[PDB]
Amino acid sequence: SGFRKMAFPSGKVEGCMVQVTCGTTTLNGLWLDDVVYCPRHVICTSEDMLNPNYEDLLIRKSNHNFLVQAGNVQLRVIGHSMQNCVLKLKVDTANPKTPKYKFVRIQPGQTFSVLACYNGSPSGVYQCAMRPNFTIKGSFLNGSCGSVGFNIDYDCVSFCYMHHMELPTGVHAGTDLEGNFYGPFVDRQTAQAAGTDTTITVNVLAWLYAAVINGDRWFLNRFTTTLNDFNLVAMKYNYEPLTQDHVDILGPLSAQTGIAVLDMCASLKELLQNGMNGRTILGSALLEDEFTPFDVVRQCSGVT
Amino acid sequence: SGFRKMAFPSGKVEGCMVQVTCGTTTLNGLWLDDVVYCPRHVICTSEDMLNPNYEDLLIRKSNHNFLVQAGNVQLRVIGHSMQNCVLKLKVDTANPKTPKYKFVRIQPGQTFSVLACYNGSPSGVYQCAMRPNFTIKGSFLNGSCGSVGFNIDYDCVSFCYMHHMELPTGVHAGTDLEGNFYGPFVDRQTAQAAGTDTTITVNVLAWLYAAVINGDRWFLNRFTTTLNDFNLVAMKYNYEPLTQDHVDILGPLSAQTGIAVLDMCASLKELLQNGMNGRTILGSALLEDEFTPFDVVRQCSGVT
Ligand SMILES: O=C(Cc1cncnc1)Nc1cccc(O[C@@H]2CC(=O)N2)c1
Numbered sequence: 001s002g003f004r005k006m007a008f009p010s011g012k013v014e015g016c017m018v019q020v021t022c023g024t025t026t027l028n029g030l031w032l033d034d035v036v037y038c039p040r041h042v043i044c045t046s047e048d049m050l051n052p053n054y055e056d057l058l059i060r061k062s063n064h065n066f067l068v069q070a071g072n073v074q075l076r077v078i079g080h081s082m083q084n085c086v087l088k089l090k091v092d093t094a095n096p097k098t099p100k101y102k103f104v105r106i107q108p109g110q111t112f113s114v115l116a117c118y119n120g121s122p123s124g125v126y127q128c129a130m131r132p133n134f135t136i137k138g139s140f141l142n143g144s145c146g147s148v149g150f151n152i153d154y155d156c157v158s159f160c161y162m163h164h165m166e167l168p169t170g171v172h173a174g175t176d177l178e179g180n181f182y183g184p185f186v187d188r189q190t191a192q193a194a195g196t197d198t199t200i201t202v203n204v205l206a207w208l209y210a211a212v213i214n215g216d217r218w219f220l221n222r223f224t225t226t227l228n229d230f231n232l233v234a235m236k237y238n239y240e241p242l243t244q245d246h247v248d249i250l251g252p253l254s255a256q257t258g259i260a261v262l263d264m265c266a267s268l269k270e271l272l273q274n275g276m277n278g279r280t281i282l283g284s285a286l287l288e289d290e291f292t293p294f295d296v297v298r299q300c301s302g303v304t
Numbered sequence: 305s306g307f308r309k310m311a312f313p314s315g316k317v318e319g320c321m322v323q324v325t326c327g328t329t330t331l332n333g334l335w336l337d338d339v340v341y342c343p344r345h346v347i348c349t350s351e352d353m354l355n356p357n358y359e360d361l362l363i364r365k366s367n368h369n370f371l372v373q374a375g376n377v378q379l380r381v382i383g384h385s386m387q388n389c390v391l392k393l394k395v396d397t398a399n400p401k402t403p404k405y406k407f408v409r410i411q412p413g414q415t416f417s418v419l420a421c422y423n424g425s426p427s428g429v430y431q432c433a434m435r436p437n438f439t440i441k442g443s444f445l446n447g448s449c450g451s452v453g454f455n456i457d458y459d460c461v462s463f464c465y466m467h468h469m470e471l472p473t474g475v476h477a478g479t480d481l482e483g484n485f486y487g488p489f490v491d492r493q494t495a496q497a498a499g500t501d502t503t504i505t506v507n508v509l510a511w512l513y514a515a516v517i518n519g520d521r522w523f524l525n526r527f528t529t530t531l532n533d534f535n536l537v538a539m540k541y542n543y544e545p546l547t548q549d550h551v552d553i554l555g556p557l558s559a560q561t562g563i564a565v566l567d568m569c570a571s572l573k574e575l576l577q578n579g580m581n582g583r584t585i586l587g588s589a590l591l592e593d594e595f596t597p598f599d600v601v602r603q604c605s606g607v608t
């Protein structure tokens with residue numbers, strides 16, 4: 001029993017974190033095989049950030065200008081290339097702690113763990129979700145860039161995110177491990193504002209199933225609804241529209257609890273229209289949307 | 305910017321997790337040097353749990369009855385002893401991944417990270433706090449016993465907790481690494497109920513300082529109060545009484561934000577007497593008490 005915002009064990013990813021210094025800028029890099037991945041804004045001075053032309057700035061850089069340090073030993077850079085918004089610094093040594101890995105581009109609504117790092121050293125790990133507006137609500141300070149988001153499938157690390165930016169609103173923007181930003185963000189110090197932060201409805205439902213599994217059932221009502229009726233209410237509350245794909249995805253939780261998805265939607269609908277009335281669900285006074293249906297099944301079964 | 309419930313990187317502790325099997329019971333063990341630590345209820349059958357006499361049950365056990373497995377290799381048990389509610393299984397091999405470590409007994413209010421494990425394999429990491437009633441609100445299933453709580457000071461792991469029990473109310477009980485339970489709990493399947501779960505006031509204040517540092521200032525009012533006046537209100541709301549020691553501990557956060565501790569207490573007092581009014585502080589609709597003043601300073605500065 002008990003439901004926590006659980007992050008994946010970070011050891012496999014700690015063994016991949018290095019420090020990348022280019023001139024005065026020091027940020028984090030991911031060392032997998034003989035390549036070090038890091039944000040391309042490592043080559044910028046805070047001034048360059050206003051209107052950077054990365055191909056022009058990159059000409060002035062040689063292999064010896066990138067200082068890669070793993071722990072306390074210096075890595076030799078034998079090649080460098082730009083792939084979208086990440087730099088790939090080919091080193092002469094393959095990372096002996098390189099785990100089995102993949103580079104995946106996740107969809108909004110999906111959750112992942114972030115190992116926050118500074119000077120190539122991990123300082124904390126937390127669970128995140130790619131918001132529907134392609135921002136993340138991380139916890140990052142200056143020097144955190146190059147910190148990565150990942151999922152673990154048994155022994156394989158699926159790297160999905162690398163931190164690049166903090167918007168003026170305190171939310172974060174970053175890329176996949178191919179350098180492509182999630183959303184419309186660019187690595188430039190210009191006016192970038194995030195869109196509406198809608199609630200991930202399927203994740204709220206999965207978390208409501210987790211609450212029923214854990215004993216908190218006060219919110220279960222005597223009502224049902226339809227996908228169209230629920231969506232009318234969901235749109236009014238800036239919730240993501242719910243599809244038959246999401247209903248199907250909730251199938252295992254619906255089967256385990258004996259509560260049909262549309263019944264749980266009707267419970268959600270009353271919670272939206274009436275609030276919690278000072279009550280809490282899983283120690284939370286708001287509707288939590290950072291657990292996917294897969295996360296609830298993993299945490300409620302013990303997927304190692 | 306951004307404030308997350310951050311857990312310490314778990315790698316150093318993952319390298320210490322092993323599986324301990326005694327008859328039909330399989331749980332987790334901590335392998336540090338040539339010793340494996342685990343809950344003593346590993347020797348019990350679910351029946352024995354009702355009224356166990358561990359010294360009597362232990363006589364029937366030999367070194368060869370404890371099966372210790374690290375990853376996929378079997379460890380040889382050359383000695384076994386009971387220390388309070390933990391078994392120490394001396395193995396013939398020192399753990400090559402033993403980090404620099406200490407066994408500390410934390411006080412209620414203090415926070416720590418938990419690496420939840422099953423069959424000696426870590427499956428998740430999350431941040432906890434030792435509740436003032438000596439329970440923890442973890443996320444543990446059957447087979448999680450022997451999962452440990454720790455803090456990391458640069459490269460040294462201070463192990464503070466080992467999971468042993470789940471009370472009928474869904475809260476968790478466990479010991480320090482010397483086998484002594486936090487609180488009045490015993491490793492017996494009998495009626496054990498937790499006391500009042502009071503809120504850790506100093507942690508709420510530290511989290512209010514974190515909110516001001518992160519931009520959420522709506523709750524800052526034009527009032528002040530006294531330690532006695534605040535405590536009158538705190539006791540009414542099942543908050544822990546606030547001492548000059550806690551005020552002193554909040555000193556660095558008070559200095560960084562320019563908000564005196566008693567002013568922040570008056571802000572807390574209005575939040576208690578009036579609720580959030582549908583507002584949120586750091587994305588939370590309730591007053592969070594699982595960040596110590598030290599955690600806020602660590603997260604807001606980047607202590608690796
Ligand atoms: O924010 C950081 C660094 C950092 C990261 N995380 C927390 N704190 C700091 N990097 C950065 C890089 C490039 C552009 C930029 O400005 C964009 C323009 C806009 O609206 N924000 C920012």
Ligand SMILES: O=C(Cc1cncnc1)Nc1cccc(O[C@@H]2CC(=O)N2)c1
Pocket residue numbers: 001345353444445446447448449468469470471472490491492493494495496497
């Ligand atoms: O609860 C577990 C195992 C487990 C751990 N965590 C989640 N789920 C299961 N162990 C256990 C061991 C000894 C006594 C016991 O019962 C005490 C009596 C009472 O009120 N509870 C329980």
